[PDB]
Every structure is written in structure tokens, then in C-alpha cells.
Design a protein around this nucleic acid. Structure first.
Ligand SMILES: [Mg+2]
Ligand SMILES: [Mg+2]
Ligand SMILES: [Mg+2]
Ligand SMILES: [Mg+2]
Ligand SMILES: [Mg+2]
Ligand SMILES: [Mg+2]
Ligand SMILES: [Mg+2]
Ligand SMILES: [Mg+2]
Ligand SMILES: [Mg+2]
Ligand SMILES: [Mg+2]
Ligand SMILES: [Mg+2]
Ligand SMILES: [Mg+2]
Ligand SMILES: [Mg+2]
Ligand SMILES: [Mg+2]
Ligand SMILES: [Mg+2]
Ligand SMILES: [Mg+2]
Ligand SMILES: [Mg+2]
Ligand SMILES: [Mg+2]
Ligand SMILES: [Mg+2]
Ligand SMILES: [Mg+2]
Ligand SMILES: [Mg+2]
Ligand SMILES: [Mg+2]
Ligand SMILES: [Mg+2]
Ligand SMILES: [Mg+2]
Ligand SMILES: [Mg+2]
Ligand SMILES: [Mg+2]
Ligand SMILES: [Mg+2]
Ligand SMILES: [Mg+2]
Ligand SMILES: [Mg+2]
Ligand SMILES: [Mg+2]
Ligand SMILES: [Mg+2]
Ligand SMILES: [Mg+2]
Ligand SMILES: [Mg+2]
Ligand SMILES: [Mg+2]
Ligand SMILES: [Mg+2]
Ligand SMILES: [Mg+2]
Ligand SMILES: [Mg+2]
Ligand SMILES: [Mg+2]
Ligand SMILES: [Mg+2]
Ligand SMILES: [Mg+2]
Ligand SMILES: [Mg+2]
Ligand SMILES: [Mg+2]
Ligand SMILES: [Mg+2]
Ligand SMILES: [Mg+2]
Ligand SMILES: [Mg+2]
Ligand SMILES: [Mg+2]
Ligand SMILES: [Mg+2]
Ligand SMILES: [Mg+2]
Ligand SMILES: [Mg+2]
Ligand SMILES: [Mg+2]
Ligand SMILES: [Mg+2]
Ligand SMILES: [Mg+2]
Ligand SMILES: [Mg+2]
Ligand SMILES: [Mg+2]
Ligand SMILES: [Mg+2]
Ligand SMILES: [Mg+2]
Ligand SMILES: [Mg+2]
Ligand SMILES: [Mg+2]
Ligand SMILES: [Mg+2]
Ligand SMILES: [Mg+2]
Ligand SMILES: [Mg+2]
Ligand SMILES: [Mg+2]
Ligand SMILES: [Mg+2]
Ligand SMILES: [Mg+2]
Ligand SMILES: [Mg+2]
Ligand SMILES: [Mg+2]
Ligand SMILES: [Mg+2]
Ligand SMILES: [Mg+2]
Ligand SMILES: [Mg+2]
Ligand SMILES: [Mg+2]
Ligand SMILES: [Mg+2]
Ligand SMILES: [Mg+2]
Ligand SMILES: [Mg+2]
Ligand SMILES: [Mg+2]
Ligand SMILES: [Mg+2]
Ligand SMILES: [Mg+2]
Ligand SMILES: [Mg+2]
Ligand SMILES: [Mg+2]
Ligand SMILES: [Mg+2]
Ligand SMILES: [Mg+2]
Ligand SMILES: [Mg+2]
Ligand SMILES: [Mg+2]
Ligand SMILES: [Mg+2]
Ligand SMILES: [Mg+2]
Ligand SMILES: [Mg+2]
Ligand SMILES: [Mg+2]
Ligand SMILES: [Mg+2]
Ligand SMILES: [Mg+2]
Ligand SMILES: [Mg+2]
Ligand SMILES: [Mg+2]
Ligand SMILES: [Mg+2]
Ligand SMILES: [Mg+2]
Ligand SMILES: [Mg+2]
Ligand SMILES: [Mg+2]
Lengths: 387, 132
RNA sequence: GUGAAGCCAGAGGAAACUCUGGUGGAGGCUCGCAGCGGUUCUGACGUGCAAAUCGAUCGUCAAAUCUGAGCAUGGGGGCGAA
RNA sequence: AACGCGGGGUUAAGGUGCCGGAGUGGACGCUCAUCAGACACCACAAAAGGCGUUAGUACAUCUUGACAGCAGGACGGUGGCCAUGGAAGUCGGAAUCCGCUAAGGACUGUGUAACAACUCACCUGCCGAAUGUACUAGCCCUGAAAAUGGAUGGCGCUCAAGC
RNA sequence: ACAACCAACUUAGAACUGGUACGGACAGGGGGAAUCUGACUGUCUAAUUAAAACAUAGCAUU
RNA sequence: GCGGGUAAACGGCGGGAGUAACUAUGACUCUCUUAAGGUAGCCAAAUGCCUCGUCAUCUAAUUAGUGACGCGCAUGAAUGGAUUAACGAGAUUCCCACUGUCCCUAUCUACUAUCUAGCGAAACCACAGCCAAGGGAACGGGCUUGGCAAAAUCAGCGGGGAA
RNA sequence: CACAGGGAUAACUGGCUUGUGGCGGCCAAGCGUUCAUAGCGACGUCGCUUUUUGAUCCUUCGAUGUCGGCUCUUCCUAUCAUACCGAAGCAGAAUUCGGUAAGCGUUGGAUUGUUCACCCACUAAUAGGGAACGUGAGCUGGGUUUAGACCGUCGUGAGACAGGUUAGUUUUACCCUACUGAUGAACUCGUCGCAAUGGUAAUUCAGCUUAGUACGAGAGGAACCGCUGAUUCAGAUAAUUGGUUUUUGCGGUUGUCCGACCGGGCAGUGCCGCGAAGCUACCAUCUGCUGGAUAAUGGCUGAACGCCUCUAAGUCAGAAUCCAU
């Protein structure tokens, strides 16, 4: 008989294989559509999630209730030391899809990126690209020029192989993250020239993104272990007097199909899923060398983005950072993949220019009531430890 | 139902008894429904400061008892925040009896009134004292 | 815990018997521990610790209360507040 | 079609596009379905309807020429008889005869304080071989709505591999 | 009529004091307005029924 | 057999037709039958079917509760009627208090489950184990036609095995 | 209460049937001021459906757990709402009928075990159904309901009642498959990729402006674009707020024990206040795209059929649809 009272199904079947993500690093499954009339530019970047904080700003939204009034907004911080471009990959079209025809590497690769090619780097001979390095000396780079010319002649998609400078982060990991970033704009020859000129060179995130831009964040979400249906799918708890467990789904299928169906909520892995969250506004791109990168026009105190006592379980953001409105998937220390938006933005919320007024830097480790150590000293006065 | 109201924490579900902040003669208001409530299985309709509800008078004058009245919640004890980021709450839950058009049955309001009710209902704003 | 008869003293009134402090220690009375029982969770367990147990919560708890040993009643018989 | 164990030949019912042994065999037609159809028993369908093919009846034109696509004419007693300030065909009703024209009625409707101009029946005239009506029954279509995904057996098949 | 010596606890009153707290754990009644029903205490289906069933005093009959 | 007694013995305790200056009902009457025709009381009650009876109250809303009403299918006097303070691990309705019963879930602790060393059963078992449709003993894991289909595995799970 | 059996034979699923129940069609006397066919609609007649109940007894009586509710998924369309269209006895507004349409939703409560129903209220709407009358090794046990018990009627009685009432044990998964996740041999080991195939997601409302304007004698009174919010759903996240406390972190405090103090033990976490970290809440915050092909319909050109005609050849647009991103 029919279900007595109508109700929508719990959860979405669009994310249905609720399994652990295949790879820790987020995967850019689609790059923004290329336009040859635009100047050559990278379409993505990598960073590391440092934490969240609070900002205050005057809202510029005519017709809104909070128009021209202060609003408090949560933002996320991504520590973004400059990436190093180390390679080029050319892609050709085929009746079976895109395929990489060839890739060209820089003459010298650092140990950070060489660690990515090893499981036991400590006890290895570290011979990762030793024979390949000789191609730049043999015949005056004839093979390198040959591969670059092949990419120019045949390939229609050009990507750079770039890696993070994870040693500039407070992370204990020494193995860098390496990924392909598509070059958009210009001709294929322009793309190849741009990528080759960027070889073993640092690119900073302000050359890729800019303030008030809407971007996407790709990452693997926070992992929970084996989780029951109540939390995994949001089902209703069964009554208190239920025998053999109330944290369940009462009926997991009718009789006639005679199988448990794929659409029925079941206990299993929760979290640690690959997610591409979209439409996140960049509120600020702060520089590492700026001693007041968390200061404001109306807040002139010279302070950096790091909260008092440091980001909890991260450390200090000593490098360039991006400020993103709202939250992004993934825990702290996670490798974030920032991608340019695939959408066209016309709404005033997306097109608004954001002017910060104050950035919270109080302690994340408790009910922090002070923004700076000098403010703490001024408020408390002299202590016993000051002698 | 009020228009333009921003999302806020709803503190009073159906079945809640709140104080009567006006001088209509009712002592309390027993919420039986909320105007903007949608449809969802098992979910009790709930209202916050500044939205219209349907209520009955459990304690008060006999010619106000035993009937259904429109009412507006003027303050609630459940903490909530506005776009300014400040979480605030009142000492008690209280509302006032109004017409379906939003005109108060009483002529005075006792105690403070949340800003949402004053902004959304001009009669309550005119009859109110301290706002937020 | 309550406080029945009986008893002491003092107040009224006219009588007769009214009242007020005490004393006393009755009741198949009452709260409640052990014991005895077994209401609910329709809890645990339900190839159990257990062919009836375990936990919490409950009924009764000075008498139609609980209990040992000896003895009697033996199958269409016994015994039965049934 | 009834049965011992084998070899060869020929058949029955049923099949010959592939699965599948044997025909993308031959002849003449019909059908296009945004639910085709293809199952003797048998596994779903009816009353009612639709310009595709055939057929039966009657009709028009037979050059004196059909339907469709066009210009022009409705003369003259005629204010006829009743009705009226006034309606001469076009308020009210019963009725429209003709001396000169291939065709024009005291008139089919329009107009109008009375009119008049205008219009129709019809035809001399442009033309040029096929036309209209109502039926009959083949195929197809509408009628034709149920629950896991799905069954001319499947694939597929349209100068069929359907009827 | 006071002084001295001896001896436990039980009750009452006051000041001060702090965390406005104090039967600080433990221990330890939720209460009220009514209806049906059996008067009450008590008893039974050990191992699905504790009840309004049985018993009871009282009443009546033989 | 006959004839008397006996209901705190078993038990029983009725139908029909008119009737009051409008009227409704029927105090009253006329009439058929029994052993006697339900008296005092009580009631949609643990006893009333129709029925969620009718009125009032309780609620925003009450097939529930209570108070009334009574031609009561089928209430009723030691087969005891009515009432009743006190008592009740008896059944029922409401009110205050209270709270995760719920909105709507979250979190913490111990012991399991889990992995390891050691020890180590039982139920059950035609053969076995992916489906869809068809036909079939009218609900197939096996048959027909299709979809398909890749070792060996661990924790859960309660659709199926008409377990 | 027992035994031997029976699916030779009833109660529940399924199967055939469809009287009955439900839902349509054809005809059209008549209604509809006028007018059969805007919309209804008699007499008659053709059907469909298996969400009614009958009829049958084919399967099961060496047992397929028998009502309802809760929970959860999916499917159907005979569409309640939402999208786009056509017609009116459609001036506007509000309605009504019909087409393409099942993508997306279809609620909170009082009484009742209910099913069904009826009220209160919200809502865009509170549509109807199937899945062994879906779903008991998922629950529960209110109903049916063995044994205890009461009443009424019936019976001489033991006892009966498709009458009322009260109390009445809900067992087992560790196997196979299915499902949810998790490893993994072989093709040297790694890094970076591609994308067959499978899944797929958003939903509805309100306010402002348009505008007291179009339309209307007047009462009254749209809409397109644009702006701002909100409901339901989904995916994340913890700056803030709230919850949680074995941080047994700090403090307070009861009893007892260590002779007193200090400092501690015990009361399975003694209790109380605060309590970071972590987890977590529409109890908190963030985010949720546009291309193609179409259906109904509206058209262009244009025959059949010298005229016409959206159609026959060809072709334009077009839905919450379909297929992709
Ligand atoms: Mg949740
Ligand atoms: Mg249970
Ligand atoms: Mg913190
Ligand atoms: Mg006693
Ligand atoms: Mg005991
Ligand atoms: Mg139990
Ligand atoms: Mg167990
Ligand atoms: Mg026990
Ligand atoms: Mg407990
Ligand atoms: Mg032979
Ligand atoms: Mg032979
Ligand atoms: Mg042939
Ligand atoms: Mg062959
Ligand atoms: Mg041929
Ligand atoms: Mg032929
Ligand atoms: Mg065609
Ligand atoms: Mg057809
Ligand atoms: Mg056949
Ligand atoms: Mg026909
Ligand atoms: Mg024909
Ligand atoms: Mg076919
Ligand atoms: Mg065949
Ligand atoms: Mg063939
Ligand atoms: Mg042929
Ligand atoms: Mg006290
Ligand atoms: Mg007690
Ligand atoms: Mg008793
Ligand atoms: Mg005894
Ligand atoms: Mg027993
Ligand atoms: Mg027995
Ligand atoms: Mg018992
Ligand atoms: Mg009487
Ligand atoms: Mg009585
Ligand atoms: Mg009665
Ligand atoms: Mg009643
Ligand atoms: Mg009574
Ligand atoms: Mg009653
Ligand atoms: Mg109630
Ligand atoms: Mg009632
Ligand atoms: Mg009553
Ligand atoms: Mg009687
Ligand atoms: Mg009697
Ligand atoms: Mg008598
Ligand atoms: Mg009696
Ligand atoms: Mg008596
Ligand atoms: Mg009493
Ligand atoms: Mg286990
Ligand atoms: Mg072991
Ligand atoms: Mg075997
Ligand atoms: Mg099958
Ligand atoms: Mg079948
Ligand atoms: Mg079958
Ligand atoms: Mg089998
Ligand atoms: Mg096969
Ligand atoms: Mg396998
Ligand atoms: Mg299990
Ligand atoms: Mg099973
Ligand atoms: Mg079996
Ligand atoms: Mg049979
Ligand atoms: Mg029928
Ligand atoms: Mg019709
Ligand atoms: Mg049937
Ligand atoms: Mg049968
Ligand atoms: Mg059977
Ligand atoms: Mg069997
Ligand atoms: Mg079964
Ligand atoms: Mg229910
Ligand atoms: Mg339809
Ligand atoms: Mg419609
Ligand atoms: Mg759907
Ligand atoms: Mg609602
Ligand atoms: Mg059925
Ligand atoms: Mg069922
Ligand atoms: Mg089951
Ligand atoms: Mg069960
Ligand atoms: Mg059931
Ligand atoms: Mg029961
Ligand atoms: Mg019984
Ligand atoms: Mg009974
Ligand atoms: Mg019962
Ligand atoms: Mg009991
Ligand atoms: Mg796909
Ligand atoms: Mg006008
Ligand atoms: Mg979440
Ligand atoms: Mg906190
Ligand atoms: Mg916290
Ligand atoms: Mg604690
Ligand atoms: Mg401490
Ligand atoms: Mg101590
Ligand atoms: Mg000790
Ligand atoms: Mg304790
Ligand atoms: Mg706290
Ligand atoms: Mg045309
Ligand atoms: Mg065409």
C-alpha cells in the first residue's frame, strides 16, 4: 500500500557512492572554458587550510535590510605560499577523449617535489630525474625543444605541472603536492611559451586570483569513521521502546523486489568525500611580507592574520593568504585546490566589491577578548612575571 | 505574514504558552499555529520574534477566552542573532493580540519589544516603549 | 509517625457535664530496613548465569506475618481463602 | 506423430535476415503508426469516429463546356394594392404577370425622418478536363489509464524481415 | 540561702561570617478535581492473567 | 397422579386504541392476555444494538471524560438495589509541577561488539545461491527468452531464501 | 481440551471472473434568459480497472506470523499544487473546463486501536493508489485475542454470543544472496592524467517596484522585467552562539579514613560552579550551473484540392519534460 504521509527522501543520490575519496589531494575535474582572445593565465592554485575567523564589513546591497549597515561574517583562511612551476603537459583530442601526448620537465627539480615520487625517500638513492636532467645538456636541449615543438604543433590543451612549497608552511609534512593547472587564453604557442618561461619559477596567488572574485574550493571533507544511518543520512530516530536498536531504518525495503535497493539508507563510511564547493567570494589576498596584512583602512593596528596564540592545530600564516567568505570542505592542514569559477556571475551579491572594516585576531583557543598582545598588556597592567 | 523578515532562531513551537505584553485583558497566549509555516512530516510549526501566530487565551478575561486570535511575538527567551552578529535574548516569551491586518487589540505594551516586531508591525512600533 | 481506653491537674457552670495542660501506649493503623512477595519497564537475557534468572521500580513488614524438623491426608484419591 | 539398437533417403506439423538447419527466393497490391505490425489453441479490447486504397448509387459538362479562381448588368406601368407627416421592393402579409436583350424577382440582403447609390439569384464574356454529394470495406490512426526494468522469444526489420 | 565538687546529653536565644550556601554526598512522599469498581487487612493461576476474582466480618435461609 | 405450603428455593415480572377551550404529550378512559405484569431506586453505567443517542460542560478542535435525559435491543432489588467515609502495584478523564515522549537531535562514561593469544560450540543444511519477463501447481535459484557475467576477502545489515 | 489426517475442505496473500464498487466513452430528450453540444444532462448502449465487496476453491493446514500505526524506499496516473498552453455564459480580478505533463511537493493537531471519518489550523496544495490488502528474526501490541474475571441477553445445565469490559511471555541470524561500506592477487614500482559506464537536484512562496497603473460606470483591480527575502530539500563547515565534560583542569563542599595542618584516599564520575579542546545544532554559519532535442500549442512557406490550409515535402518558436554539462 502507498506511503501514508508524503515526505522527501533523506539525502541525495547525486553523491551516492559514499566511499572514501580515491585521493587525498582534490581533483579538478573541469577547468574553465578556454578563450583564445584572453591573455594567457593559470586557472587554478593550491593552498593549505589554516582556519576560520570573523570579519565586519559595511554591506553594499540596495534593497536589502542590512544595506549600508555593519555585518559580521565568518571567513576561511588559506595559507598560500607561492607555487613552483616545474612542467608542461600537452593534451590532444581523440574520439575517446582528451589524452596527454607528452610532458616536458624543468632541468632541476627540488627535493620537495621529488619526495612526491617516492614512498621511502629517506632510504632511497634519490635518482628521480637524474637521467632526464641530462637532456638539457645533450645536443643543446634538442629533445626538450622537440617535445615543446610537438606540443605546439599537435596539442590543443596546455597545462603546467606545479607543486607547493610546503616547507614554508608550519606543516610537519615535507612531501610537496603536485598538480596540473590549465593555461587559458592565447594560442597554443602562447601557452607553451608562458609555461616554459615559468619553469622552476614561483607564481604567487595574487597573479592567479584577485579580490572580490568568485572561486571554487576542491578538497576532501572531514572524515568520520563507520557511521550509522541516523547521522549518515539524517533519518528519524525510532521510538525509545524499540527493541534491538532505535538508531536504524525500520523498513529497508518491500517484499516483491526481493532485494535491498541502492536507494535505502545504510550504515557505512561518512565524510572524507571529494567535494567541489562553488561560489566563494575572495575577501582579501594578504601578503606574507606585509606586517599589517590583517589591518584595515578603519582599523590601523599593525597586526597579521594569525590569531593570538596561533591558529589552533595549524600554527602561523607567514605567507600569502586568501580570505574566503563562509566555509570550505576539509579540515585544517588540508591541501585546498582553488579553481576559477565555471559560471557567469551577474547577481549583485556576486558582483559586489567588498571593503573590510575589521578582522578578528583574538585567540581561537578560548574566549579570546583581546586582539593583540599589546592590547592585553595595556588592559591587564603589570603582572608578577614582569618583575 | 510579515514580508522581508530575515531568518532567525525560532524559539516558540506550537503548544508554547507565552505572556501577554499588552493590556487587552489576556494574561497569556497559547500558540496553536504559525502563519508562515510550511509542510514537513512531524515538524512542529515554530515562530520567532516578530511573526504572526494563531493563539488562544488560557488565562484572562472570559470574553477573550475560548477563541482563536491572531498574535505577534514581541520577545522570546531563546537566544538569536541578527546580521550584526550579536546573540541576544529576553527574559520571557511575550506577544500581543492583533487583527489579521496587524492592528493591536490593546493600546499599551508592557516591557521591552524586540526590534523585528517593531520593524515589521507599525502599530506595535507605535505602541512600544523600549525597542531591543 | 499517629496517639484509643484508663489516670493526674487546672479552668467554667448550678446542675449534668463542658473545656484545657499533661500522662498512657491501643490498633488484623501508618512511613520504612531485613525477611516474605512479585506491579511495571511488557528493561536485561531469551542455543541465558538460570528448563523462570538478573536490574531498576514496586506490595507487605507486629500479625489472616515468615520459617525448620517430626507427623497425617495417596490418584477418579488427596488437598484447595477456588 | 506415438518410441528396440544403428546407417541412408523422404517428409509431417512448422520454418528458410541473424540468433538457426534452410530464400535478404519469385509475382501483384496494401500500410508510415510522436502506441506500426508481425502469437490457430494463446495469453488483452468494443461501441463510436478520421480527405490513404478500392468499390456501389445518383448528379453537373459534353464544348450548347463542369468546380475553383473574375469585370459588368437587376430595364421600363412600379407613389401597384392596404398601410403614411413620411417607408417608391427592402416597417407589418398574402401573391408576382411582361411587348426590345445570351441574363435581371413588384426582388436575397445592405442603406435610409421618404430616397438614391450598393448587393444577390442568372448570364453573353476570361479558362478548358475532369467535378460535387451520400455511402460500402481494406490497411492505418483516435477511442486505448497502474503500479521493479521488458519483451512479435530476442536482435532488429519500412522499394519489410509487416499484411 | 550561697559556695564548692561531680556529670551527660537535649532544647532555646544572640552576634559575627561566606558562594545567598548549608538534610551541600548519602538518604529521601509529586500533588490535586472526579468517574467505574471491590468495604477495609488478607489470598490465588510456582513458569504469560494479582484483578473488579477468592476470602472476610455482617446478614439470611436450611 | 391428587390436594395444601414455600421465592434471603431455581427463577419470572405483558400488548393494543382514543383523550385536555391552537397544538404536542397524555393525567383519564376503552380493550386483549398472564402466575405476576418491573415497585423503590439506577442508567448510552464494566449492562443500549441503533450510537460517534440528545442537551450542557471540559478544548481552537474531543467517537474520550463528567453532569443531566430515558418506551431501558436486553437496568432493578441477598440471582441483592441505591449510596458510601477510609483503603487499592485495580480501570478511566482532566489540572498544576516536571521532564529528550516529541520538535530534533547532539554529547560523555563503562562493558561489549572490533583486532590479537589461548580455548572453542550450536541451530540449520536435496543440490545450491545475481536478476527481468514468460509459461508453469495460477508469486522460480534452476526451465524459455533476454540482461549480463572476473580471483580470494573483512565489518555491518535485516529485502529475499514463500529462512 | 486431545489424537490420526486433510490444502479432497473454510478464515489471510496470490490466480481466473467483474455481478457489485470505482473510472470513462457513444447518443442527446431536456436544462442552461436567448443556445442540445461554454458547462450539465434522461432513456439507452459500449467499455476500462482490480485501491471495494462478492463468486470460485487452483497453491499453501509435518504453519508463508493473521489489523493498525511508526519508519523507509521506490513505482503508477485516473493531476490537488507547481511549468507551459487552448476554451468559456473569460472586461479586470477570482474561477471553470481541457491539453502536454508524475520533474517536484502534498503538513501540524483534538476524539477514535482503527481503517474510514469529522472537526481546529497552517499552507502553493494539503490528489488518489500499488509494491504478498509493501514493511512483526524492523518495532509496538492499542484491535482481533487461548487459558483468570465481570455484566447484559440466551440456556434446566455444562455453557453460548460475528455484544460490552478488565488482565494477559512478541524467540533465533554467526549461513547464502542482496545491500552499505572496506581490503585485495595477477599485469615492475610510482607520479600525473583521460573518461566508457553508472548516479544526478533542487523546490515553492512572500514583500518592494511595475501600480492604485492596464481593464473597468463604479465597487474593484493583473502581469513581464528588476530588487530583497523566506519555505522544503541537498552538500559542507565550527569564526561566533548554544549543548555536551574523565581536561576528573581549577575552585567550593558532605560523610569517612590517613593524629591536626598541608596534601590526599574512598562514596564504581560523591555532589555543585565555571570549564578550554573535540564533536555537534535551520539551536550556528556557508554554498547549490546552463546547453541541446522536444510534447501540447503558436507560426512561416505550401500543395494535395487553380481557392484555402502550421503539414503532406521543408521549416521557426516552445513546458517544472527528455538528454547532456
Ligand atoms: Mg541532523
Ligand atoms: Mg520490547
Ligand atoms: Mg575555539
Ligand atoms: Mg498493617
Ligand atoms: Mg524478595
Ligand atoms: Mg521483557
Ligand atoms: Mg541476544
Ligand atoms: Mg525481578
Ligand atoms: Mg535508572
Ligand atoms: Mg531406428
Ligand atoms: Mg534418418
Ligand atoms: Mg517464405
Ligand atoms: Mg543458416
Ligand atoms: Mg525478396
Ligand atoms: Mg513486393
Ligand atoms: Mg509520419
Ligand atoms: Mg492502435
Ligand atoms: Mg506462443
Ligand atoms: Mg470500427
Ligand atoms: Mg476509410
Ligand atoms: Mg510488437
Ligand atoms: Mg519467433
Ligand atoms: Mg524469421
Ligand atoms: Mg508476403
Ligand atoms: Mg528543605
Ligand atoms: Mg515510597
Ligand atoms: Mg479488595
Ligand atoms: Mg493458602
Ligand atoms: Mg503466572
Ligand atoms: Mg495452568
Ligand atoms: Mg504476574
Ligand atoms: Mg420504573
Ligand atoms: Mg451503581
Ligand atoms: Mg440505559
Ligand atoms: Mg457516552
Ligand atoms: Mg453513578
Ligand atoms: Mg463511559
Ligand atoms: Mg485527551
Ligand atoms: Mg465526551
Ligand atoms: Mg453519563
Ligand atoms: Mg431482565
Ligand atoms: Mg433481572
Ligand atoms: Mg426479592
Ligand atoms: Mg441482574
Ligand atoms: Mg446492603
Ligand atoms: Mg470512597
Ligand atoms: Mg559482531
Ligand atoms: Mg582468539
Ligand atoms: Mg551437499
Ligand atoms: Mg525473478
Ligand atoms: Mg504469471
Ligand atoms: Mg511468475
Ligand atoms: Mg527455492
Ligand atoms: Mg540463460
Ligand atoms: Mg565473483
Ligand atoms: Mg541482524
Ligand atoms: Mg530475511
Ligand atoms: Mg530453506
Ligand atoms: Mg485445493
Ligand atoms: Mg466492473
Ligand atoms: Mg460532453
Ligand atoms: Mg477480487
Ligand atoms: Mg483458497
Ligand atoms: Mg495452512
Ligand atoms: Mg510448508
Ligand atoms: Mg517469512
Ligand atoms: Mg498514527
Ligand atoms: Mg494523463
Ligand atoms: Mg491541469
Ligand atoms: Mg520522482
Ligand atoms: Mg503547514
Ligand atoms: Mg490488492
Ligand atoms: Mg500486509
Ligand atoms: Mg519482515
Ligand atoms: Mg516478530
Ligand atoms: Mg502489521
Ligand atoms: Mg491487549
Ligand atoms: Mg479471556
Ligand atoms: Mg466478549
Ligand atoms: Mg483486554
Ligand atoms: Mg498485569
Ligand atoms: Mg552520465
Ligand atoms: Mg475607463
Ligand atoms: Mg551536518
Ligand atoms: Mg561553550
Ligand atoms: Mg564547546
Ligand atoms: Mg562532571
Ligand atoms: Mg578540583
Ligand atoms: Mg575528604
Ligand atoms: Mg579503603
Ligand atoms: Mg551515586
Ligand atoms: Mg557549561
Ligand atoms: Mg499559407
Ligand atoms: Mg512535415
Amino acid at each position: 500500500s502507498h506511503r501514508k504521509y508524503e515526505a522527501p527522501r533523506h539525502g541525495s543520490l547525486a553523491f551516492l557512492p559514499r566511499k572514501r575519496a580515491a585521493r587525498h589531494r582534490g581533483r579538478v575535474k573541469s577547468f574553465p572554458k578556454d578563450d583564445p582572445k584572453k591573455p594567457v593565465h593559470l586557472t587554478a592554485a593550491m593552498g593549505y587550510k589554516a582556519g576560520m575567523t570573523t570579519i565586519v564589513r559595511d554591506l553594499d546591497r540596495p534593497g536589502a535590510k542590512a544595506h549600508k549597515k555593519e555585518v559580521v561574517e565568518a571567513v576561511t583562511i588559506i595559507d598560500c605560499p607561492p607555487m613552483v612551476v616545474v612542467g608542461l603537459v600537452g593534451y590532444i583530442e581523440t574520439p575517446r577523449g582528451l589524452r596527454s601526448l607528452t610532458t616536458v620537465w624543468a632541468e632541476h627539480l627540488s627535493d620537495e617535489v621529488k619526495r612526491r615520487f617516492y614512498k621511502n625517500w629517506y632510504k632511497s638513492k634519490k635518482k628521480a630525474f637524474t637521467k632526464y636532467a641530462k637532456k638539457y645538456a645533450e645536443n643543446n636541449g634538442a629533445s626538450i625543444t622537440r617535445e615543446l615543438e610537438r606540443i605546439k604543433k599537435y596539442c590543443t590543451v596546455v597545462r603546467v605541472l606545479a607543486h607547493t612549497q610546503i616547507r614554508k608552511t608550519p606543516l610537519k609534512q615535507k612531501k610537496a603536492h603536485l598538480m596540473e593547472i590549465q593555461i587559458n587564453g592565447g594560442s597554443v604557442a602562447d601557452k607553451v611559451e608562458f609555461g616554459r618561461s615559468l619553469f622552476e619559477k614561483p607564481v604567487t596567488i595574487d597573479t592567479i586570483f584577485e579580490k572580490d572574485e568568485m572561486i571554487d574550493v576542491i578538497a576532501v571533507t572531514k572524515g568520520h569513521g563507520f557511521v550509522g544511518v541516523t547521522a549518515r543520512w539524517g533519518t528519524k530516530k525510532l521510538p525509545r521502546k524499540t527493541h534491538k536498536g532505535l538508531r536504524k531504518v525500520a523498513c529497508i525495503g518491500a517484499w516483491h523486489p526481493s532485494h535491498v535497493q541502492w536507494t535505502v539508507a545504510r550504515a557505512g563510511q561518512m565524510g572524507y568525500h571529494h567535494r567541489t564547493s562553488v561560489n566563494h567570494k575572495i575577501y582579501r589576498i594578504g601578503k606574507g611580507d606585509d606586517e599589517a596584512n590583517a589591518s584595515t583602512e578603519t582599523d590601523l593596528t599593525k597586526k597579521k592574520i594569525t590569531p593570538m596564540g596561533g591558529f589552533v592545530r595549524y600554527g602561523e600564516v607567514n605567507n600569502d593568504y586568501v580570505m574566503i567568505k563562509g566555509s570550505v570542505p576539509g579540515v585544517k592542514k588540508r591541501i585546498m585546490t582553488l579553481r576559477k569559477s565555471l559560471f557567469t556571475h551577474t547577481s549583485r551579491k556576486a558582483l559586489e566589491k567588498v571593503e573590510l572594516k575589521w578582522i578578528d585576531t583574538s585567540s581561537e583557543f578560548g574566549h579570546g577578548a583581546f586582539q593583540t598582545a599589546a592590547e592585553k598588556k595595556q588592559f591587564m597592567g603589570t603582572l608578577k612575571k614582569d618583575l | 505574514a510579515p514580508g522581508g523578515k530575515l531568518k532567525m532562531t525560532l524559539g516558540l513551537p506550537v503548544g508554547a504558552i507565552m505572556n501577554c505584553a499588552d493590556n487587552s485583558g489576556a494574561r497569556n497566549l497559547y500558540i496553536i499555529a504559525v502563519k508562515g509555516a510550511g509542510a514537513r512530516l512531524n515538524r512542529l510549526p515554530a515562530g520567532g520574534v516578530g511573526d504572526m501566530v494563531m493563539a488562544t487565551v488560557k488565562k484572562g478575561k472570559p470574553e477573550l477566552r475560548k477563541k482563536v486570535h491572531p498574535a505577534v511575538i514581541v520577545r522570546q527567551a531563546k537566544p538569536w542573532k541578527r546580521f550584526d552578529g550579536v546573540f541576544l535574548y529576553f527574559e520571557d516569551n511575550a506577544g500581543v493580540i492583533v487583527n489579521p491586518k496587524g492592528e493591536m487589540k490593546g493600546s499599551a505594551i508592557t516591557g521591552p519589544v524586540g526590534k523585528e516586531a517593531a520593524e515589521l508591525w507599525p502599530r506595535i512600533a507605535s505602541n512600544a516603549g523600549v525597542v531591543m
